[PDB]
């Protein structure tokens, strides 16, 4: 029904704003399209589904962060007087009162949600990933009835990959490219979109060198000349994905553990506290989360700015066709073979590795990539039947060359997190006991403001250089006391969750 | 042929004091006793061929750190002039030298292997133990393919657990009823076989309250109800491991980790080194690794001891219808049935649970384990022809309800060791840095035996008390230095080992 399979999909698949407003088709894509490519959406049905109750779930934890703090304030005024010696020894009667406690306002949505909101979270993100994989493990089961009732040379790699590890010099550059452009000597309005142009200025830059790759793997595995023709996409996509990986999320790892360590500079407390490129962001903090927040908060919605080339790079080749010709398959001759599939789940997985793997900096991770879903499945199906003039219907099955890659992706979810869940909301459930150890428990933990604050910060230049209080040295020892507690969490956390995500394809897959 | 299926499994089979000298017959015993009974002995036979490798590296060890020692004596006069100080406050005139360095000729074959030979060894079990299930997993496919060719209410238990875990307190009572069979005070023969009375008046007692489970856990599966008949063995297993599981290596836990912790006794120096039971062990220390070796020693042995019992027995049983009797399937009238599968396969996997998981006390642990299985095997089929007169021939394939058990066993086999990996041989590897930091290198480690024994102990009553050196208090915060130490070890182990372990069953397995 061409007059009908056209326009049953024409419209019964252009939604493309929100929801269809009825329901998801997919039995007929797989009579139209066949089962390669509606197994596709099949899964992209169920990876939206499954966001949904977790989606639902950050919302309900920046209610829960603002809410607990919105009614009592009980973490802002005890919060937004603990950077107020940040600068004290850069005041010095010269240039004294300029961002002391200008984390304050930038403290908040971090300072917010840490111990009770974030480190939940991730334990059911991880136990919902696990519960998605072994979700769609067995759904595919399902479909795969149906058409089961219906069905009648590596080592120049790793010099890659060392040349894509070299990327985070490429972020640095930019990033200290960010005093050519404006340069915002200020609180309010410079910190954010200081770091959103390097971002910006970066994140952009990425794009153009993903499809790089792909023209490289794509003859970087010819080299190798696979046997079968049709495990050829399995060295293309395995060597496809962790070049675009590491692409993509080196970033990140450098500005979520690398960048506030790796901090070597002598002079104590008369030294310090203004040490901080040349005193012009913030002698207070970093409050690395915000750094970590925002590179997050682009690339979860620079998959909607990249969306629109999906649409607009197809489109924008038209005015080449159209170009040559004013400068029933007969209009058919004129428009790009199919030759994407990968692209297809290969833009959903790094977005999956953004649900999971980066998922205690800010818990609505989920939701932001709930929004571009909906678009996502409307645009592609849209582009098969918009664009796409020659569906080959393969008429396959079984997507398990990629269950494996998406389930790796999941089991790095619990070693990341863990060290970003370990390395920024513990100083305080110990930070209880050095201090408030004798009539001052969790009631008290308001206590360690100035206490914990007093020293040079709370990271490896924060306890210890503390030498000329009463004499690094001598004091740099209790150091030692959290990167223990820091440490026990994860041998704590991963060994639990890697059982806990151990029960759910355990008794559900069958 | 009867005349000679039973000569030759009499004469093929009754090799009996080691080796048949020949070979090893599998097929044939897969046409007389089924595809079930030959399935065992092919899992029997393939676990012994795989320890020859990993026993001949425990011989490996031994020779290797006693010839470490036994040619220059490095850590021997340095390590047998450590506890010369472990009774100094002790002393002070009054019972001074008693067993000040009683430790020295027990403190050898402990300290002799620990940190090349131990901390080594249990990296290749690990690795051997995925290269053996690995294994294992392929060469049932051999003989799968063989056959293949041929072939035409819970809560309850919970409950039960934790009455196991109370046996904790068992071993405790006899442990404290050593006092009123031999009650030795001395350092020479007084060590040894005082702990070993308690362990034999013990490692007895489960024994007889082994087969106590085994009336138990069929009946307590009867209350399930199991629809599908043969998978009430599933049911049964699976209890009836777990059940014997903590059984059995429960009191090595008591010995591994808590036995030496949870030691709480105030008074410094002048309190501390005499209270010991009344001064009459070993004031100078503990090395509870020789608690640890000895109970294991038992155990790897025991196996033998009870292994008599397998035929003293059923023999046994002769003495009450030879009393009746006095007091061709005519004469098989007076035999017991089989009903005994699972027994099998059960005391192997105990033996299994010593090779893998405490691997790291002493490394010779795989040959006892190997110095059994040739009797172990070559008792059994014994037991086939000489008793159990009713072969089923059940022809079933497939071990696999055992293969997740015995695995699971190899994934428990890195935690285990782990802690008891770390725990034992890592003040050492960080204790060059507190003292030798200037000049004193790994050559130099000989130079932390004073001064890191000058302090109470090493353990948790270690490095706390020495606020009487200058002034717990002030002091007991070194003790966090190595104890992140021992954590950053199996945050390290665990994730490689897992992951070098992932190498074993990614390309051999296919
Ligand atoms: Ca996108
Ligand atoms: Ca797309
Ligand atoms: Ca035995
Ligand atoms: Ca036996």
Redesign the interface.
């Known amino acids: 029904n061409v007059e009908f399979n056209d326009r049953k999909l024409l419209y019964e698949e252009w939604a493309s704003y929100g929801v269809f407003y009825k329901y998801q088709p997919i039995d007929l894509v797989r009579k139209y399209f066949g089962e390669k490519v509606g197994l596709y959406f099949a899964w992209l049905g169920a990876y939206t589904q499954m966001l949904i109750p977790a989606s639902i779930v950050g919302v309900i934890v920046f209610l829960y962060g603002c809410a607990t703090v919105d009614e009592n304030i009980p973490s802002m005024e005890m919060c937004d007087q603990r950077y107020n010696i940040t600068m004290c020894p850069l005041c010095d009667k010269t240039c004294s009162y300029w961002k002391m406690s200008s984390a304050c306002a930038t403290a908040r949505a971090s300072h917010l949600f840490d111990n009770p909101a974030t480190v939940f979270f991730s334990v059911f993100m991880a136990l919902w990933a696990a519960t998605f994989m072994e979700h769609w493990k067995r759904k595919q089961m399902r479909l795969n009835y149906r058409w089961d009732l219906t069905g009648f040379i590596i080592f120049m790699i790793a010099v890659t990959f060392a040349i894509v590890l070299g990327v985070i010099i490429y972020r640095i550059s930019t990033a200290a490219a960010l005093a050519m452009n404006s340069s915002p000597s200020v609180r309010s309005n410079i910190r954010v979109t200081v770091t959103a142009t390097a971002v910006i200025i970066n994140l952009v830059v990425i794009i153009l060198l993903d499809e790089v790759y792909g023209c490289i793997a794509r003859w970087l595995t010819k080299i190798e000349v696979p046997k079968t023709e049709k495990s050829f996409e399995e060295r293309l996509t395995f060597k496809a994905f962790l070049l675009k990986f590491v692409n993509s999320y080196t970033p990140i790892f450098y500005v979520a553990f690398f960048k506030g360590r790796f901090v070597g500079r002598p002079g104590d407390y008369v030294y310090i506290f203004r040490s901080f490129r040349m005193e012009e962001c913030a002698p207070g903090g970093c409050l690395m989360e915000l750094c970590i927040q925002l590179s997050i908060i682009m690339l979860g919605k620079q998959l909607i700015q990249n969306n629109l080339f999906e649409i607009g790079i197809p489109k924008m080749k038209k005015f080449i066709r159209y170009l040559k010709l004013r400068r029933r398959y007969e209009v058919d001759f004129n428009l790009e073979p199919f030759a994407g599939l990968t692209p297809e789940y290969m833009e959903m997985i790094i977005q999956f590795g953004f649900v999971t793997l980066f998922v205690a900096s800010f818990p609505l991770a989920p939701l932001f990539a709930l929004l571009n879903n909906i678009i996502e499945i409307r645009l592609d199906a849209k582009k098969f039947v918009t664009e796409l003039r020659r569906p080959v219907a393969i008429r396959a099955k079984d997507i398990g060359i990629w269950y494996n890659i998406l389930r790796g992706v999941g089991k790095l979810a619990v070693?990341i997190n863990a060290f970003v869940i370990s390395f920024t909301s513990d100083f305080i459930p110990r930070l209880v006991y050095l201090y408030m150890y004798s009539q001052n428990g969790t009631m008290h933990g308001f206590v360690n403001h100035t206490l914990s604050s007093f020293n040079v910060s709370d990271f490896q230049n924060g306890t210890a250089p503390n030498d000329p209080l009463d004499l690094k040295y001598d004091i740099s020892?209790?150091f030692?006391?959290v990167?223990?507690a820091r440490?026990?969490f994860?041998?704590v956390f991963?060994?639990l969750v890697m059982f806990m995500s151990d029960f759910v394809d355990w008794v559900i897959p069958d």
């Open positions: 070693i020892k209790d030692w006391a990167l223990a440490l026990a994860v041998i991963q060994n």
